[PDB]
Amino acid sequence: GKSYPTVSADYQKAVEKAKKKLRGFIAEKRCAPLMLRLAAYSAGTFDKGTKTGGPFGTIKHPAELAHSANNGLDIAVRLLEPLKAEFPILSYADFYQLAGVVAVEVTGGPEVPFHPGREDKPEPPPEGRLPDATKGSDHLRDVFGKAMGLTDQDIVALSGGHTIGAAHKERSGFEGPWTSNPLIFDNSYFTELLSGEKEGLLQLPSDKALLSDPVFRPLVDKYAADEDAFFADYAEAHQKLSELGFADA
Ligand code: HEM
Numbered sequence: 001g002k003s004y005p006t007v008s009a010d011y012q013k014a015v016e017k018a019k020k021k022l023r024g025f026i027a028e029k030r031c032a033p034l035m036l037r038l039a040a041y042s043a044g045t046f047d048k049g050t051k052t053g054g055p056f057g058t059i060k061h062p063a064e065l066a067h068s069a070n071n072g073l074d075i076a077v078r079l080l081e082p083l084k085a086e087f088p089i090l091s092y093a094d095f096y097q098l099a100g101v102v103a104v105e106v107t108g109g110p111e112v113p114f115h116p117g118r119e120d121k122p123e124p125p126p127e128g129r130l131p132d133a134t135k136g137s138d139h140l141r142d143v144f145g146k147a148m149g150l151t152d153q154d155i156v157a158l159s160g161g162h163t164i165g166a167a168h169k170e171r172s173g174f175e176g177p178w179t180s181n182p183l184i185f186d187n188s189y190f191t192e193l194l195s196g197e198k199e200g201l202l203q204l205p206s207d208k209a210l211l212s213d214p215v216f217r218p219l220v221d222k223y224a225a226d227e228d229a230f231f232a233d234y235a236e237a238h239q240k241l242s243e244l245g246f247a248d249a
């Protein structure tokens with residue numbers, strides 16, 4: 001259902017150059033997970049009913065999120081601001097989604113297709129809000145399904161975004177990485193989830209909910225056994241997330 005807008009050749013040129021600059025920057029700064037989180041969270045504010053929120057530049061520097069969990073995203077946007085300034089023609093909305101795509105790529109994940117043309121909207125993110133690490137499967141379907149309009153498969157695949165990065169007790173309160181290789185995009189989120197709790201590693205109640213649900217669980221097993229399949233489903237889900245409300249909601 002996507003009809004992508006036309007952008008000028010100068011715009012496409014900036015996209016390509018920004019993509020390369022983002023690779024080097026994100027790799028050097030070791031901030032892929034924070035950038036993936038910024039992109040996903042920004043896109044994830046979409047609500048299909050009201051057609052509000054989505055990946056439209058609504059969280060930017062200087063951010064004021066202040067609430068538990070969302071802290072850290074202020075750091076992400078500040079980190080990106082000097083580079084963004086080198087590409088004034090790009091919308092913030094496109095720039096942040098491009099950074100999320102690059103974050104997945106430079107850590108070794110799939111190549112998520114990217115289409116430019118998101119407009120920076122006025123304005124802000126209403127919150128309040130939804131995504132709660134202490135809740136379960138019903139809550140997940142409320143957030144991704146009822147609000148965002150994604151499928152059950154997308155929910156499991158996107159949860160695998162936790163295969164890179166960590167929680168911080170000063171940010172959400174949770175603490176530590178999901179995996180032993182938190183800068184490597186692979187299927188280890190699912191293998192660690194299956195094998196139970198382990199010293200040094202984190203599982204949110206929202207991660208654990210995937211294990212108890214009749215639809216989610218077989219997908220967890222599938223992804224833990226077949227990284228290629230995870231990569232395919234992840235690339236599909238990430239593209240959809242990144243394009244919520246955009247080029248036909
Ligand atoms: C399913 C609902 C989700 C919940 C409840 C949730 C919750 C959280 C929490 C509590 C943290 C820790 C924040 C901190 O303390 O620093 C976190 C981090 C993170 N999230 Fe999620 N998340 C969800 C979905 C997603 C999705 C869909 C993606 C991307 C596809 C994602 C990517 C990440 C990444 C990469 C980090 C690590 C950030 C870092 O290393 O600084 N999350 N998430």
Ligand SMILES: [K+]
Pocket residue numbers: 163164179180181182183184185186188189
């Ligand atoms: K990993």
